[PDB]
Structures are given as structure tokens and as C-alpha cells.
Amino acid sequence: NRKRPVPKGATYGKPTNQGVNELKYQRSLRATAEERVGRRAANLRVLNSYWVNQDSTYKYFEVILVDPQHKAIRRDARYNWICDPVHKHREARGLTATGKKSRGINKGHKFNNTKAGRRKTWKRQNTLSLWRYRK
Amino acid sequence: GKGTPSFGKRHNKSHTLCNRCGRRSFHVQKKTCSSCGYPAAKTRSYNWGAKAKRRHTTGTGRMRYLKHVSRRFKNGFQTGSASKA
Amino acid sequence: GRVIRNQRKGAGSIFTSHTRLRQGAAKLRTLDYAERHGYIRGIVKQIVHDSGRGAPLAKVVFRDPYKYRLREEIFIANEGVHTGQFIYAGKKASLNVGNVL
Amino acid sequence: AAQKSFRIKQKMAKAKKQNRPLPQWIRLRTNNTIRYNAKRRNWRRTKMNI
Amino acid sequence: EKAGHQTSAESWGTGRAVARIPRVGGGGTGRSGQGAFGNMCRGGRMFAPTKTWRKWNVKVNHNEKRYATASAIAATAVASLVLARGHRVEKIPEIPLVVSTDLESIQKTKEAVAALKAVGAHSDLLKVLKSKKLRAGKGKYRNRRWTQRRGPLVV
Amino acid sequence: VFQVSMKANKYQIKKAVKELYEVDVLKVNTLVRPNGTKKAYVRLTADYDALDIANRIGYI
Amino acid sequence: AISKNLPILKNHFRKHWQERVKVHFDQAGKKVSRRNARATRAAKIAPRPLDLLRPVVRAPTVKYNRKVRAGRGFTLAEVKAAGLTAAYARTIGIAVD
Amino acid sequence: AGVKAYELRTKSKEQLASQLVDLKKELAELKVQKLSRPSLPKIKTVRKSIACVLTVINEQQREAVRQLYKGKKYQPKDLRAKKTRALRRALTKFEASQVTEKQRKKQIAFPQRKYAIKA
RNA sequence: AAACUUUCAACAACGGAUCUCUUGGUUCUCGCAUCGAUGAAGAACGCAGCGAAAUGCGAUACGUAAUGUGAAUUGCAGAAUUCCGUGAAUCAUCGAAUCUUUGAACGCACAUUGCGCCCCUUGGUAUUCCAGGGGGCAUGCCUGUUUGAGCGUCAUUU
RNA sequence: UUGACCUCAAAUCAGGUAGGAGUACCCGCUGAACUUAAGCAUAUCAAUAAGCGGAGGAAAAGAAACCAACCGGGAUUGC
RNA sequence: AUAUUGGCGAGAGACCGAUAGCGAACAAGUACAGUGAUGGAAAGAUGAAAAGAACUUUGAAAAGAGAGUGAAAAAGUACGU
RNA sequence: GUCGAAUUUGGGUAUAGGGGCGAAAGACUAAUCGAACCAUCUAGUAGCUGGUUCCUGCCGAAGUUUCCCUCAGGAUAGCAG
RNA sequence: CGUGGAGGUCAGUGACGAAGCCUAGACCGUAAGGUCGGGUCGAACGGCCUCUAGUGCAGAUCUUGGUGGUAGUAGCAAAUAUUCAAAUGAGAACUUUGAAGACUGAAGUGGGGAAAGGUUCCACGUCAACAGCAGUUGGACGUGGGUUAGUCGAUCCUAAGAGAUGGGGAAGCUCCGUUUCAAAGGCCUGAUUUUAUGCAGGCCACCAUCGAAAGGGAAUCCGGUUAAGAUUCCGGAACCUGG
Ligand SMILES: [Zn+2]
């Protein structure tokens, strides 16, 4: 779990916000892996990742990285999409396969809160729309 | 004696001139500036400090290079020279 | 309430030991190869006063079995030990005062 | 202090050159508005805080 | 939206022989200690600041809109109403004034004005010319600097 | 006595005074003036006299 | 709070609603843009009819199954019956689903 | 007065270097007489003339290097384009227009037919 | 009866309201996508014949080059040929340069205008010392190159 | 003795690339209390402010492991 | 197709009119305060044109009284009313 | 009062706000301490106090009923337009 | 009834004088108010029909600004103390000089410095404001001049302590740690005199850096000189470091 980083467990609020220990960090452990790798090699683009092993203490993943400056990648149009500036730090913004799993990005009624973005969905239904000729 | 007599012992500067912002906010013993956060890589700013952000943002300085980018965009980042038309 | 005094001791800000005038950590010699098969002879150069410590410290000089140098150790003095006494540290040292059997 | 660093003395040099009234030809320029030096400093009135 | 509120002023409370209005802190300015955040304070925020979601347009029933256009058309054929509005139709032969379709194909202003003066709009075109005056308020320098009468409506 | 640049050291002032006026420099004493500029005290050897070259330069 | 005879109201205005308020002052301006886009798009595709042919289709939801409606595409079985291929039909302004 | 750039471009590398030195000799003398005369506005013309020569000298030397590095990759950074950091990292026209052989076959077999609906 | 106090009017003070303005603000709408290791935003210090600031610029310093227009700038001085013209201008435009010390700031440091290493070149009778000029020396990561380490490990010989 | 291979290194090696600024809008993380409940702890404020990471001219989503139950519809987004 | 209190370039208003409207119509995030984080002003209007009062006189002088400019000094750089 | 020491003191350094530091007074922590200063949330809430801007005309009260963690307040019936 | 603005109308008023302001001058209305005359003034403004609102003040220990009575009043009384004459100036209790009288009395009201200040230093001109009297005087105003180092300091060393790197945590801003579970380097001698430096060799295991103008530390004294600088300038006589 993610231990709440408060000194001596004092939260200074209401009882529902008094939890310290058993809080669960909405992002996955695999996402933390790609984020920490993505900072190490900032010249690369995180493509995907997978599970290799685990023990009691650590969980082990392998990260696939793509070089957007390599001409074997800038050519070969099957892969040169990753070279666009709109794909900078996909892992940071949750554009990876696990990033969209945690974000709830999927189709159906089971994903009503998160189908097109949770912040986007909340802002849309919490806005006052007023026209020139009031309806 | 916490008033006038204590104010006579003030001769030890706690802050000195900064190098990144030059504001005289560089803490001598913490080796840090209380305005911009030097020597940290990022410049210190906060969203609750709206006036503070306004005081040192882009456009308050000379804009030695950014003041010409829009002109170079208008001409489509042209290269070369005029042809003595 | 307020953080009590014995809780402020563990942060170690003004409760760290005063170690400015101390001679050094009083440790035995390293058990490398001579002290477990034979012995090695040392000499008590001086007995000194370690600030903060009741007992006096003995400075003992050995030889390095593997290099030509004069490795020096800081022993806690056992009383009766004098300057110029020969200290034998090893498995085959004799049962005499100051030896490191 | 008599023994001073270079930055302090360099700012001291800039502040000495700014200790000046207006040039008298400035007031006669077309559509002039400035009438005095509004940023004048004095050692006895206001400190530099450098 | 930030007008009158770009300050960290706080109330001094009682005991300082001053009103309990919030006051600008610090010192050495001449603004420190002055009142803030009140509609009665200089440099504060006005009462009920104006919003953009105020109702600007008004919806009218389409059939009621057409009702008033029909009555407006009919009222144009009453010579008593046209004079009462001040349209200088005393010498006009008859109303509704209907002219030939050749007016619809006039391209030049000089010819168009001549046709208007020929049918009896002379005294009404001069009415607008002689009625040009400056506006009587601060609307002069809000792009409404002049006012004048309204002439004939050619259909 | 010259007003020298604020980056020039004593070695550079010697070589320049020799180069620009064809004289021999005995010693150079430099202070930073209170106005933010530098002043060089260039003492010539006994062979030359600064009076004979001050008016040659054009100031007297 | 509660007072004389009136219906119970539910006005969901206990949040910072004034932060998110959309007033459509640009209804007129955005309609000119929409018509200018159609005018500019029409020239770029100058002979083409600016929209794909769409099928007629029954509506779902027995409340609405009594009507027919414009569908999305022409149902690969249907284009084969019509005597042309979907890869080609997509190129001459036929919508295929 | 002053020097004209169109004139200086005719002179050679050594002619301009000697020209520049002579202009430093002149401006040194004007600074000497400025301490005596109440006003010497002539010093601006010599100061502008010095800047013009150094501009023409710099153009001659920079253009010479451009010919040296002509017709090869890896030219000096200050010699090649500046447009924008983001523009310089963008895909080229050749790299942007890369098409797979699968997509190339479909792009010539079934292109967008220019059709019309009148009859 | 004066003086003094109060009231009113006139003239004069104090003060800056009222009126009339407005190169400013605020709100709405429309269009576009353009910061930075090819060193950004920000800072410090400088630069004018006579400037403190604002604006502009960087030791080429209220700026250089290029193009357009076509006779100014202006407070004073000054310059005149810059006036039937490759040409005035505190003009516009701007595609070539300059761009101090810094700053993500990158040789190491930096409450210091502190301390180095390397290459070329010049001088001091100098491959080692001193000085002048020019050019370099951050980290992480990627592709490739070269040089290596490990009985990790494969074949062949005494 | 020689040559490989694997793994791991070093170089001011040959080319690059990341960092900072801005951040109205965008994608995530983290995360309150004032306040309302006429008290108050669940609730509410609010999956909001403050804090952190990452883009673009838009971003995101996006061509069904969908909605449906009908004579079925047919990527996404917005009103 | 959607958003856009930032940037750049434009068009507007039954908005405000110098104690208003942005804090700032001005050398305004300036002067000034604080160790620091931060706090943060006041301050627009002579006249069409300086034509900004030559000259005489009293005064040590500032200035006064004349004289003069101006349509107006009941407009004199403490300047519209 | 003490005045050669559990002394006095400069500079450097370390300890930061439910924290420090305290030979202990809730003392001190920049004239601020039974929880510093700064900005923001925040125009925080207040059944409580104060104020609430033109004229004339006509009509014209209540401090009572029931319920309420209700008793300085509300709902409710009454009284008025 | 009155105010800001808006659509219409009076082909309304107006530089032959709009608005504003003053007026124990006049008239109308019960009133909110309206009209007129006179003065002042200089550029826009009204009547009527409708529309719109940031629309009317005596209060809020209201806000901003200005102004009184108090009031020529309280007061300008610690640190022993001044007096005479001349000079200067329009002007002298206060400036300059001379004379007299006094005080600090060497743990000084003397002579230097550290921190801090920043040009206050010195000079010429000078009194509108400041020096709670005054002022010809000044730390005031205006205009200039002035700070010279191999030997004095910093720079160098380390102290308490601070802090990258290898690593390890943390979603992260960043935290721990200073030799740690690291493959962490240059010094002398030399050698081919294609030639630069790779090779002939040997040595070496600590280990970034920051941290003292009072700690440690290479080496300068005397005499003279300026309006203002001096262990720095000049004269003479020394020493250290590197080569
Ligand atoms: Zn700083």
C-alpha cells in the first residue's frame, strides 16, 4: 500500500480522513515502473511494459522503449507516429496500456464515470449552460 | 528590553543578494533564495501567490529573444535576404 | 500537549555526544591471520586521558605483517600496563596482564 | 564595511551615478511631463538594502 | 471578477478605536491601514458586481411578433399617424405612396434622390439633414457621437 | 594616468602602453574608482618622460 | 427556511457553480463560422455533394420502431447485392458499415 | 559621412583589417579631445564606422565558411537554420510522407474518385 | 460707544468638489499557433555631444548590415551634402550579424568579479615556469566506433 | 598460442536527445478544511482549493470484449 | 464538430469615466515598508499658439507696483471651471 | 545583587510552528506566543450588534395559540394590506 | 419628484455664450421640486413619449480626502557655562578669528578599528526646504575631486557543520547517506629524437567540493608628501615565492 506521508499519523481533519496505513494508490505498480524508467531515459518514448517476476518485496517489470531520434524509427512509417511531439511522456499522462486501465478508459455502462475522461465528464455535467434566448 | 534596546543589536544580515534573481533574499546559512528557490533548477512560484507570479512572469523583463518570435512567425521563418527589388 | 524532552533526544540536534577532544574509538586489533595461529608483539607507546571517559587509553604500536609500516592501535588500558611494556596479541600469547588471548 | 565585496561596491557605483537631479534640457522637450527626479535617494533618508 | 479583492486585508477587530472594516496591512505606503473589500470603501468592490449571465435577449412569441408587424404596416397607411410621428407628409398626394418598379433598378444615388424628391419626399429628406446634432451625454465618446431623425422607408 | 577597461589586468596595461605609445613601463598601479571604472597609474622608466608624451598625445 | 405553501424545490447550486457558467454569446458568431466552413469545404471537394449517401434503417426501442431513419452505412451484404465492392463504394461517396 | 558597406565589400581581407585599425586610431584621438572641447558630436560617426567595418568583415568570414561546408552534412550549428527548437525536431517531408507497401497498394488501387451527382 | 461673538452679502484666501473631456480600463465576438542546450523566460552591470527614469540596445552597445519610402531630427548645439539621390530619418520593414556577466546554466566553485586541466599560437635566452590571443573540458540516456574485463563460456596447439 | 560468442565497462570517442519558462484551456497523481445539516461524527463543501508530474494548438477519446431486447441500432466528441 | 481569465492579431458595447474603470489613463508592480515570504500607493486638464511677462521702479533678495502678451492673467508653469 | 566563575561576550554553526527550545515562568521562538509570520481557501458562518438614501395620499398591527435541544430564534393560527 | 444611459420626436437651446457654480432677488407647486433675473464661466445641453439601472444619505467608533475649536495654548527645563572685541553679511546669542572663563581628565567628550552604512570624506559656489530658536554655518542644496600593495587582508587549510557522486527510498516536489553492497587516479624516473607522446618500466589506494577579513598562515621598514590616499605613492634600505 501507500502509507500516507503525514508526520506521526496526525491528519488534522475529520475522522473519515484519518486513514494512514491501508490506502491504495490509484495508479498501478506497473505505471510506477514506466514513469521511473521514463525519467531515466528521457530521450526515449515508452511503448509498453510487461511482468517478468515478483517476490515479497519487489515486483519486476520490463519496459519497451523507442528512440524517436533514430532514423530506423523516423522512417518505417509503421512506427514513426511515436516521433510526434504529442506523444511526449505517454506514461506520465497515462497514455500507456496500463495508464488507460487505471484511468478507466473503456466502453460501456460500467465506465460511465470514466469513458472520455473523469475530469472532463465531471466538468461537463457540473456546468450551467445559458443561451441568448433562455430555454 | 525586547523593544528599543534589542533593536540596537541588528547588524548581522540573514539574506544577501541572489544571483538568479538578485533580490537580496539568498539565505546565507541555508544557501537558498527565499524568492526564486536558487540553487534549485526550477524557479519558485505558487498558485496562491497570484501577485507574486504576476511580479516576475514573462514580459516583465526585456524579452531579448521572445519579443521577435512572432515577427519571424509572420514571415514564415524566412531565410536569406531581400532581393533589392 | 507538547513533545516531551526525552522525545527530543532522538532527533540528535543538541543531544549528540561531544566528540571534539576524543582520541579515537577504543577498539581491539583486527583478527586477520596472526592472532588466530600465533601471536604478535606490540609496544605501549603512551597512556593518555580520553575526554568524556573515566578510564585512560593506551596507544599500542604493532607491525604490519604484509607491508613495511607501523600500524598503531588504541587500547583501553588495563591497570598495571606501563609505557614500554610489550603486548602480545594472539592465540599463542602467554597468560600475562595486557595480552589479548 | 571598509573591506567590501565587489558586488556591493559595484551597486554602490551605480547608486552614486543615479544620485542626480534632472538635466535642465529635459523639461523643454515637446510634450514633456517629467518635472523632477522622483527616484532620488539619500544616505540619511532611505537605505539601499543591498 | 478580481476587482476590489486583489489584497490580503484583514479586520483589526475592536479595541483600536476604529471601525471593524478590513484594513490593508504592512506599513510605509499610505495605503496600509486603509479600508478594503467593502462597497463603501474607496478602491473596494461594488455591491452585487455585474455578471455576464444576466438576461440580455428577450424571447417573444413568433405569432405576437407578426401581430405587431401587421399593425405597423397598417399604421403606415394612416396619414394622421404619419404626421403625428413627424414625417412631413402634408403635401404628399395620397398614402400608401406606391411608385413604379423602375425605382428598384436605379443604380446611382443622384438619380435615386431625384426620384424621391419627385414623389414628395423633399420635405422629409431635408428634415434629416437639418436635425444633425451632438449627443447629450457620455455616449458621444462611446461611438454614438451624433443623432438625427429618420427619413422614409423605401420598400 | 589612464582610465582603463574594467577587465584589463596589469600585464595587459603594460603591453598596451608600450604598443600604443612606444614607451617603457616601470610599474602599473591600478584602482577601481568609486564611479565603477578603473584607473591605471603607469610609471615610465627614467629614459622617457610622461610630460613629453602627454602633449604628444594631445592633452596638457 | 421552510415556509408557506409552496412546492419543494431542488436547486443544485451548493457548489462553486459560478466558476463553470457557459453563456452562449457566440451563437450568432459560431453560426457564421459553421456556414463559412461548409462554403470553404464545398470548394475543396468542388464536384462532390459534401455528404455521404446513407441508408434508411428501422429505429430501435419500440417507442421508436414505428419510424425509419437514416443509418450509418450500407451493410457489406447490401453493397455486394448492388453490384459493387465496399473498397470501391467508399471512394464515390457511399457510406459503408 | 562614414563608411558605406557596399564600398567595404569590394575591399579584401587585409584591406578591411587595416581599415578597421585606422578607425580605432581615429576614435582614440577624438576621446582625447572630448575632454577639452565642450561637445564633440563627430565621435558618433567614427563609432558607427567602426561597427560597419566589423560587420562586413564578419560577413566575409562567415560566407567563406559556408562555401567550405557546402555540399555536405554536419555544418556548424551557428551556420545552419535556427527556426525553432520544436520545428527543428519535427519530422522532415521525406520522413512524414513514409508509406508502407501495404498502404501504397491501397492508395493507388482505391483513391478518392472525383465524382459528382447531377445525372 | 467700541472691542469680541453670531448671522448675511461682496471681494480675497484654504481646499480641490461640480461640470465638460479621455492615447486608459472592463466585457463580448472573430482569426492564428509561434518559447528554450543553434542556450529560453528572468537577473546584474553597462551603452547617447549634452539623460536620472521610462523605452531601446550589448564593448559593433538609444545600436551594425539588408530592403521599402523618399528629405528629415529638434530642447540646445552640431553636421551639412545626406537632397534630380545605391540617399536624411528617435521612419517603416527585418531574412544577415553583434549579443557583456549570468540564468535549465554545462571545467570545479560562487557572501570570492576565486581556483584549475587540455590543444594551437606569440613573447619572456623555455615541452616542464610566467604572461598575451584563440579554441575546449556537465550529467542521464540512445545509435554507432575503438580499447578492454570476467575459468560466463565455445574450437586448436604444445 | 590464436579467434570467437555472451555479459559488463571506459573514452573531452562520431552524431543526437531530456531538463527550464509559460501553464487560460488539456491528461494524470495527491488532497483539505471553512461551510450546510439551524448542534455534530456519516454525509455536504468536493472525487473542489492548495501541492506534484506531463502535452498541444487544441488535448483527450475514438472505430465495440458497445448500446439494446426492438421490424433492432452501429467509432469518438459536442449541443 | 469541443474547450480556452495565457500568447499574438483584429472588430465591437444601452459598461466605467481619474475616490470610477485593472492595483496602475502618468519614469505602476514604480516610490515606499519588511530579515524574509510578501505588502504596495498617491499622481490626468495653462493657452489656438509660450505668445511663459521685454522694459522702468521699490527691495539685499524672494517678490511688489507699473508696463507688456493674450479672446480672456476673473488662464501666470502653486496654471480649465 | 553578584563580581575568577554553573562567569560575561563577539563571530561561525545546528535545532522551525502541534514544531524547536526551556536550571520550568506556559517562559522564549524578530515590540507577535496557552501554538510565530506570510499568502490562499475566504466576500469563511454568525438565531447577535450597528447602519440602510425622495415626496405626498389612503389603509393600518403585534407582543397572543400549538410545535420545536424551543426560551435573544423559527414554523403555525391570529391581527393588516 | 429627481439622477446616469438608451430608441423616437421638438427640422429644440447654444461661442450674439451650453453645462457647472454663487445670489437674506422674483414666480409656480402641500411637497419631492420646477422656472426666471443678475454675476462667474467657457462647449456642449435640454422639453415631451417610451426603454434601462452600479439611480436620491445625516448618521453605520462608515471609506477616502480636506478643514476647525482647543491654540499662539501644553510646551521647546538631564548631560556644571559662558563672556568681550574684530571680520563677514541686508541681517550675527548661534559663522570665522583673537582674548578670557570652564569641562571631558588617559575603564576620556583623545587616537584607531570589526559589524553596519555608502560618499556622509575633501573642495568651490550657496540658504527655497532640513538642522522643533536662528543661521552668512552644516553630515543640508548644486557642482567636481578623491581610495595606487609580491610583503596588510581575502584568496589557501581545516573546525563545528554543509553537500553532490555510487547507491537506496519517495507518485513526485525531493529525502537519506559522505565512503558507504563502485571496475572511482596521476607523480616522478625515463624511451623512439618518422613524433608526439601511445608504447620500455616501476610507485601509488587515500578519495568531489564548501565552511574563519578574531583560528592556522611565505615575506617591509623608516623618512617625506595630499584639500582629501598611503606598512600601497616618492626617496632610501630589505625580504619571500616561483623560474
Ligand atoms: Zn533568487
Side-chain angles (χ1 to χ4, degrees):
Chain A
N1 303 328
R2 180 195 174 271
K3 179 173 165 68
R4 192 185 285 272
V6 285
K8 314 210 228 175
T11 48
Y12 304 113
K14 282 140 166 40
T16 66
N17 300 307
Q18 269 199 275
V20 164
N21 278 321
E22 65 183 1
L23 323 174
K24 315 295 207 211
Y25 188 43
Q26 313 284 30
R27 278 188 105 190
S28 189
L29 281 169
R30 180 175 146 214
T32 311
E34 306 162 315
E35 261 285 289
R36 268 167 186 157
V37 164
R39 306 179 214 133
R40 180 73 175 283
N43 71 301
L44 302 180
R45 300 288 138 99
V46 179
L47 177 50
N48 217 349
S49 184
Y50 56 99
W51 177 96
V52 285
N53 217 318
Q54 83 192 24
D55 64 77
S56 174
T57 312
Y58 303 103
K59 214 178 288 200
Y60 307 77
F61 314 87
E62 290 211 284
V63 193
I64 301 163
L65 280 298
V66 180
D67 198 355
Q69 286 73 237
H70 204 264
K71 302 296 179 60
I73 306 289
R74 304 175 72 83
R75 294 134 202 184
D76 283 297
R78 266 190 206 86
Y79 279 108
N80 62 1
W81 58 270
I82 199 81
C83 314
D84 203 278
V86 74
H87 290 90
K88 287 177 183 164
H89 289 288
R90 310 167 76 240
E91 73 279 4
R93 312 175 290 151
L95 277 297
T96 313
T98 192
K100 304 172 86 139
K101 164 53 171 213
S102 294
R103 274 174 65 215
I105 303 289
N106 214 326
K107 275 179 164 178
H109 66 285
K110 281 169 174 262
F111 301 93
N112 275 334
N113 313 113
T114 57
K115 262 152 71 71
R118 196 197 91 195
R119 314 304 200 296
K120 214 197 165 179
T121 301
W122 182 90
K123 193 190 284 278
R124 175 163 46 77
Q125 52 210 17
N126 279 267
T127 313
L128 190 69
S129 194
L130 299 180
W131 300 82
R132 297 183 316 160
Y133 303 95
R134 300 288 155 105
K135 306 180 73 78
Chain B
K2 56 196 168 180
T4 302
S6 281
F7 298 157
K9 317 168 175 254
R10 290 152 144 74
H11 49 248
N12 274 317
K13 304 201 217 87
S14 294
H15 301 84
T16 187
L17 303 157
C18 183
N19 277 358
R20 212 153 71 172
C21 68
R23 196 172 152 67
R24 209 204 94 166
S25 303
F26 185 80
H27 205 272
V28 175
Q29 285 174 260
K30 282 208 265 223
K31 286 315 180 297
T32 306
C33 176
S34 65
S35 197
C36 67
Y38 183 84
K42 296 185 306 164
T43 298
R44 198 199 63 122
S45 46
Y46 297 99
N47 290 317
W48 41 264
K51 281 200 197 213
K53 265 181 180 285
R54 177 164 69 204
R55 274 182 196 128
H56 312 117
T57 187
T58 292
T60 75
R62 302 162 53 144
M63 281 195 108
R64 286 173 307 171
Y65 175 70
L66 198 49
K67 84 163 87 185
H68 299 315
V69 181
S70 181
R71 177 182 93 224
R72 308 201 289 130
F73 162 77
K74 174 185 66 209
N75 292 306
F77 292 117
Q78 62 186 5
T79 46
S81 66
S83 277
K84 281 74 176 175
Chain C
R2 164 186 278 165
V3 171
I4 75 177
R5 178 187 44 201
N6 63 56
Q7 290 183 256
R8 283 190 278 118
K9 276 203 180 190
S13 55
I14 49 160
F15 303 105
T16 50
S17 65
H18 313 156
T19 47
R20 204 272 313 287
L21 294 165
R22 285 166 182 217
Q23 317 288 341
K27 301 163 178 300
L28 277 177
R29 208 178 148 275
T30 296
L31 190 82
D32 47 358
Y33 170 86
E35 295 205 37
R36 65 163 184 262
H37 293 90
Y39 58 89
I40 179 169
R41 185 185 88 161
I43 179 174
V44 185
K45 304 322 291 313
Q46 67 197 114
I47 297 89
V48 287
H49 175 72
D50 190 66
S51 299
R53 183 197 306 275
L57 299 192
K59 306 284 191 65
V60 191
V61 161
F62 292 81
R63 272 161 66 233
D64 197 339
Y66 314 102
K67 192 178 185 296
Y68 173 69
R69 59 191 165 102
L70 205 63
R71 323 289 303 265
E72 192 254 1
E73 319 278 339
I74 293 153
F75 283 18
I76 295 170
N78 284 13
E79 63 167 281
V81 160
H82 55 260
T83 48
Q85 182 174 336
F86 281 137
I87 298 304
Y88 306 89
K91 178 194 153 100
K92 300 302 206 194
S94 60
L95 190 69
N96 275 101
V97 163
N99 292 0
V100 192
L101 291 83
Chain D
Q3 263 154 10
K4 57 183 69 64
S5 70
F6 186 81
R7 282 81 53 202
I8 302 306
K9 195 189 165 180
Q10 180 55 87
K11 303 191 96 81
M12 271 165 58
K14 184 192 216 74
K16 183 220 200 182
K17 300 180 276 220
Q18 293 170 313
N19 219 342
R20 184 211 170 121
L22 271 193
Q24 310 283 347
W25 60 271
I26 289 290
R27 285 194 192 93
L28 314 163
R29 309 172 318 172
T30 300
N31 317 130
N32 172 250
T33 300
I34 303 160
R35 264 141 191 81
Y36 60 94
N37 189 11
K39 305 182 169 210
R40 194 69 175 282
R41 188 199 51 92
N42 197 244
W43 68 278
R44 220 165 159 75
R45 288 161 206 144
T46 304
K47 293 306 180 178
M48 311 205 280
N49 295 130
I50 63 166
Chain E
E1 211 184 337
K2 321 181 315 305
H5 276 225
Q6 315 178 80
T7 175
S8 71
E10 263 168 41
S11 184
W12 282 4
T14 55
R16 295 201 71 174
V18 294
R20 294 184 294 204
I21 188 79
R23 296 189 195 277
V24 187
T29 302
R31 166 90 179 119
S32 42
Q34 284 187 351
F37 294 124
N39 44 307
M40 75 285 276
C41 291
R42 183 210 177 240
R45 169 212 30 74
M46 58 168 276
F47 162 75
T50 47
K51 305 299 185 187
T52 54
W53 50 95
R54 183 219 290 278
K55 182 184 300 167
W56 302 102
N57 299 344
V58 187
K59 166 199 184 218
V60 192
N61 291 340
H62 199 192
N63 189 24
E64 207 171 312
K65 269 186 182 226
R66 289 153 162 178
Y67 201 107
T69 311
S71 308
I73 293 163
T76 52
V78 182
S80 82
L81 291 175
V82 180
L83 283 171
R85 175 170 159 74
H87 267 296
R88 310 277 202 286
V89 294
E90 318 98 354
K91 313 291 271 303
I92 285 281
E94 77 160 4
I95 73 166
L97 180 49
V98 184
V99 302
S100 71
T101 318
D102 283 347
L103 185 86
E104 286 183 1
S105 313
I106 299 189
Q107 315 271 321
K108 289 288 268 174
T109 308
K110 193 189 179 115
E111 291 184 18
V113 176
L116 269 288
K117 306 258 195 50
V119 292
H122 175 48
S123 296
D124 199 272
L125 302 192
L126 192 49
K127 177 174 69 70
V128 188
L129 291 170
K130 307 302 291 222
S131 75
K132 180 95 165 203
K133 303 243 176 174
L134 262 188
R135 198 169 272 258
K138 294 194 198 72
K140 280 197 290 304
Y141 58 90
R142 309 211 188 166
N143 303 337
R144 299 189 294 278
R145 204 174 149 86
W146 296 97
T147 52
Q148 63 190 341
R149 294 302 90 72
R150 314 261 301 250
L153 171 79
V154 174
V155 187
Chain F
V1 177
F2 299 112
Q3 188 213 320
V4 286
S5 85
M6 262 285 278
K7 304 177 150 194
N9 65 49
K10 277 163 195 203
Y11 304 118
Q12 319 205 50
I13 304 155
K14 294 152 151 93
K15 193 151 70 51
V17 170
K18 302 163 44 60
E19 213 163 61
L20 294 174
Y21 313 110
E22 288 95 6
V23 293
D24 291 331
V25 165
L26 195 54
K27 40 196 278 185
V28 175
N29 281 37
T30 50
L31 54 83
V32 172
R33 280 197 288 179
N35 77 331
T37 48
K38 194 175 281 193
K39 186 207 291 174
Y41 292 97
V42 168
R43 194 211 181 151
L44 298 172
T45 62
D47 308 345
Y48 308 80
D49 45 341
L51 190 47
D52 197 67
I53 64 190
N55 50 3
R56 185 179 67 189
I57 284 161
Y59 71 100
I60 196 65
Chain G
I2 312 170
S3 184
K4 59 205 82 68
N5 189 28
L6 297 153
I8 296 303
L9 304 169
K10 301 169 99 166
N11 291 299
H12 295 43
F13 290 94
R14 285 81 181 280
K15 290 177 206 176
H16 288 105
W17 58 278
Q18 286 164 104
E19 290 184 22
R20 288 90 58 191
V21 179
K22 184 62 181 223
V23 193
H24 307 266
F25 308 108
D26 44 9
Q27 185 169 36
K30 195 179 281 280
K31 186 192 180 171
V32 189
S33 300
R34 262 199 301 283
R35 283 167 58 84
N36 286 8
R38 296 193 272 257
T40 300
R41 184 176 191 259
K44 183 186 73 175
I45 65 178
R48 298 203 262 126
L50 203 80
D51 63 339
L52 312 177
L53 180 78
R54 309 276 171 174
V56 58
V57 69
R58 305 292 303 181
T61 311
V62 65
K63 174 182 177 174
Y64 288 119
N65 70 347
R66 78 200 209 271
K67 300 170 185 175
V68 298
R69 152 166 81 71
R72 183 189 176 86
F74 270 100
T75 300
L76 299 174
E78 279 162 359
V79 309
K80 175 174 171 63
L84 82 169
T85 65
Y88 175 64
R90 283 192 155 107
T91 61
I92 49 162
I94 296 161
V96 192
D97 183 19
Chain H
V3 307
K4 321 271 186 48
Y6 73 71
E7 288 214 24
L8 302 172
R9 271 157 195 138
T10 77
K11 303 170 159 192
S12 175
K13 182 174 73 175
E14 294 80 13
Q15 284 173 300
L16 282 164
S18 66
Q19 164 75 294
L20 172 66
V21 170
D22 291 331
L23 278 168
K24 290 163 168 175
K25 299 298 293 295
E26 179 170 353
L27 190 143
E29 277 187 353
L30 274 71
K31 282 189 288 208
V32 176
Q33 54 212 35
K34 184 170 172 263
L35 315 169
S36 283
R37 284 151 51 51
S39 295
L40 184 68
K42 180 147 186 303
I43 191 167
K44 190 180 179 131
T45 59
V46 189
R47 192 156 272 156
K48 301 289 95 175
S49 305
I50 281 167
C52 185
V53 178
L54 275 166
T55 316
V56 169
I57 291 174
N58 195 230
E59 293 179 353
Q60 282 180 2
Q61 283 171 353
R62 267 175 86 90
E63 182 65 26
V65 182
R66 268 188 270 257
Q67 317 289 346
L68 198 148
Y69 279 90
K70 184 182 285 184
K72 64 163 75 170
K73 51 197 298 204
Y74 303 140
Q75 310 182 7
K77 263 168 181 181
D78 63 358
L79 274 187
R80 52 178 181 257
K82 176 67 182 106
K83 317 184 285 307
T84 297
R85 178 185 184 123
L87 283 195
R88 276 191 277 111
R89 271 143 193 81
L91 288 184
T92 54
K93 289 294 290 298
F94 172 73
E95 293 176 329
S97 75
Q98 285 310 297
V99 177
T100 69
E101 191 195 319
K102 199 197 171 164
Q103 290 314 304
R104 189 86 212 90
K105 290 167 186 185
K106 279 197 264 221
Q107 276 181 7
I108 47 166
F110 311 105
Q112 170 74 232
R113 312 282 318 253
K114 171 191 170 191
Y115 72 100
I117 177 169
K118 183 58 180 67

